[PDB]
Design a protein around this ligand. Structure first.
Ligand SMILES: C[C@H](CCC(=O)NCC(=O)O)[C@H]1CC[C@H]2[C@@H]3[C@H](O)C[C@@H]4C[C@H](O)CC[C@]4(C)[C@H]3CC[C@]12C
Ligand SMILES: C[C@H](CCC(=O)NCC(=O)O)[C@H]1CC[C@H]2[C@@H]3[C@H](O)C[C@@H]4C[C@H](O)CC[C@]4(C)[C@H]3CC[C@]12C
Ligand SMILES: [Mg+2]
Ligand SMILES: [Mg+2]
Ligand SMILES: [Mg+2]
Ligand SMILES: [Mg+2]
Ligand SMILES: [Mg+2]
Ligand SMILES: [Mg+2]
Lengths: 302, 109, 302, 112
């Protein structure tokens, strides 16, 4: 028994930003070997990087929040990070708590805040948090500490306590790992790869809620596998027999074959594509496992 | 009360220069001061930074000098190009969130 | 034969509010037979109510948004609803588009908005939207039409277009179905049940981001199955051989049995519990399938 | 200008009465008016509603009458109780989001 969940891409959950999958494509123009830390799983069930089981952990974090007002900046939150199930975060062999963002830019986050001001007790406060690539904020989620702030003329009278932070929007998105440890290197899942000559990465794409003062173009973010596949492998714990799995992407109502591809053991899909521009595929198909294959198995082009 | 304040907007014309005075409170005397460029705010491009002394620093078309008796560091930008218009920041280097003040730079031809 | 994902509840996704599963309990004081529309699936893979596959669809919707300013109300959004994958929504055999909230209260939603105003273009706006139980807003998601608003003194100059609305907070939550069709009846998945005498519903609990002016108590919301079980069944499409599945909930690090329960074909779990007060359980166990049983198999009490 | 306005806050006393005047712009003359109770705003419990005429309506201790000449509908609450305190709304019925105005109603005891 080695199979995939019978779920169309358009109905799947994205693995690096909590939103549906909207696109399926290959693009030789983009980095062929991204070092994404979320949405990384071995076919045998081993989660890699900061990949979580649940899509609700993706691009989120939990923490003990301590708030302090700073003239000239506003209300400042010092988040002491926890794993999103409440278990203690211990700096170890990964970049950050499971699900922490693995991209850069300025992130609007939202947390439950209790206030002491009269007439309101519970509200949701939007903070700004700089992720990367480089920052003067000295973010160190690897060490379990990050800083956010919200513009405030005076104290918001917030009560310190535990929080779960979820992303509201991205500002100046860059698909490059954030500042995990004040600019120092941390344990990272390796760059996705390798690929045979003529093979390129299959990309599951969604789009992120964006702040952009000039450009209305949507912000894309790709992942190697949808979150359904991540938990599917984590739960099944398959025995791996070869370097990759031969898959066929089909429309089951027609049976028409859209393309064949190789799902490497290490959790990415490669298509043989010699074109130069992006090639988008329909998202209403199903991935079908055919057999185990060796690394040098040559795919048919598309 | 605010640790650092400066001009909200400043202007110069192409090939000219401009000066920016970043006033700060006395407790930040012995901290590095810097002049940053671009948004997002806290990932901006540092153009020049001091060594926490009054020594003037010059890098490309930008210079910074900290007057620690009056508690002001002065930034100059020379040979102004239209490409220099945008968002800049008076900065103070410290652990965690740096004290920063937004300065908008406008360029006329 | 039926099997289940080897995932601990504390690592699963809640199926009615997009957030982690934090609690696992029974509570006789709560309604024994709720009419939840999400988190409803048949063991043979049949989705029930408005249940979607992806957890990112839970308590969200997609729409063609049209904005008109109303003096005394602010910016008013008329959402012509779409299925969250872009497929045209057609009134049919369920209460609303897939994933639409199945509870009541006043919901803050976030959508991508585009403005024509100088100095900015893209931003994320929070709207207030009344769900139910009854409203004067004439909400009719069954017909693909709902209304929301954000208080404002003048037009925000928003550009009409497509949106994905995600939930920010709940105000005045009530675990009763919302206004699906301006007060009229709509097709609904039946109440959960029935149960044997002495059997009660197993609840997977998360807590919702809340606006409350007086009380700091968290707002619990329960569901019958985690989203991982929903997708697991929809994908597998098992063959059902009796009325229910006998399950054991163990700590697999110890083999300690925490309780036995019955997963009925119609998508809900039952425990034998005679107490009156609530009883909570560890969230780090695993559900294991034992065998098919009749609807009359009497469980060991807890 | 706003379509319907009234008093932000009123205070009545036990066994007493209150009168609330909901002023509205002429465009809403031929719409139904009503008086609502509770929060959230748009799931509030309607206590009395007109039929878009000027006929007076009374239900329990609440009455409403629309003066379509001066564009004011008047609400009266009689035999006030402590339990009557809370948030209320002047309302104009229409398709979609109704024009509404928040009216906080305080009730206290007659001092001794
Ligand atoms: C106050 C919030 C509930 C409201 C909220 O902030 N978010 C709910 C949502 O995602 O919509 C509570 C409810 C349960 C809490 C979490 C759980 O207790 C588990 C865990 C416990 C740790 O002590 C702190 C983090 C962490 C992960 C908690 C964070 C805060 C939570 C989430
Ligand atoms: C502008 C937004 C992107 C930002 C956003 O609003 N949400 C992304 C997030 O969850 O962070 C675009 C990107 C893709 C768009 C969706 C897709 O095109 C699919 C679908 C297509 C329908 O024509 C309209 C609704 C619907 C569902 C679209 C809604 C708006 C989307 C989501
Ligand atoms: Mg640093
Ligand atoms: Mg942009
Ligand atoms: Mg710093
Ligand atoms: Mg109605
Ligand atoms: Mg409450
Ligand atoms: Mg209405």
């Amino acid at each position: 028994m080695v199979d995939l969940p019978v779920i169309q891409p358009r109905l799947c959950t994205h693995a690096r930003w909590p939103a549906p999958v909207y696109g399926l494509l290959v693009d030789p123009s983009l980095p062929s070997n991204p070092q994404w830390q979320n949405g990384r799983v071995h076919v045998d069930g081993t989660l890699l990087g900061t990949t979580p089981i649940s899509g609700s952990w993706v691009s989120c974090f939990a923490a003990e929040a301590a708030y302090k007002f700073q003239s000239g900046t506003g209300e400042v939150a010092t988040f002491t990070l926890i794993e999103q199930d409440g278990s203690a975060y211990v700096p170890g062999d990964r970049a950050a708590p499971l699900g922490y963002p693995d991209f850069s830019g300025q992130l609007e986050i939202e947390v439950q805040t209790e206030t002491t001001k009269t007439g309101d007790k519970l509200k949701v406060t939007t903070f700004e948090m700089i992720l990367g690539p480089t920052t003067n904020a000295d973010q160190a989620p690897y060490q379990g500490r990050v800083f956010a702030s919200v513009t405030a003329a005076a104290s918001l009278d917030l009560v310190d306590g535990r929080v779960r932070a979820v992303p509201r929007s991205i500002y100046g998105f860059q698909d490059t790992i954030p500042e995990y440890n004040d600019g120092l290197l941390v344990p990272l899942a390796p760059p996705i790869g390798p690929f045979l000559p003529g093979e390129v990465l299959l990309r599951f794409r969604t789009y992120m809620r964006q702040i952009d003062t000039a450009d209305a173009a949507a912000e894309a973010i790709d992942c190697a596998l949808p979150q359904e596949f991540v938990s599917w492998f984590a739960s099944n714990a398959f025995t791996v027999q070869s370097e990759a799995l031969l898959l066929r992407y089909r429309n089951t109502l027609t049976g028409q074959l859209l393309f064949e591809c190789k799902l490497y053991n290490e959790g990415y899909i490669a298509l043989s594509y010699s074109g130069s521009g992006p090639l988008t595929f329909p998202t209403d198909g199903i991935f079908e496992v055919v057999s185990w294959v060796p690394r040098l198995y040559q795919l048919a082009s598309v | 009360e605010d640790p650092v304040t400066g001009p909200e907007e400043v202007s110069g014309q192409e090939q000219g220069s401009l000066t920016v005075q970043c006033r700060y409170t006395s407790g930040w005397k012995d901290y590095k001061k810097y002049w940053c460029q671009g948004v997002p705010q806290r990932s901006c491009k540092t153009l020049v930074e001091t060594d926490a002394s009054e020594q003037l620093v010059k890098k490309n078309r930008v210079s910074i000098r900290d007057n620690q008796r009056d508690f002001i560091f002065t930034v100059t930008m020379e040979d102004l190009r239209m490409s220099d218009a945008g968002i800049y920041w008076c900065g103070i280097t410290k652990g965690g969130l740096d004290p920063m003040f937004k300065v908008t730079v406008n360029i006329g031809p």
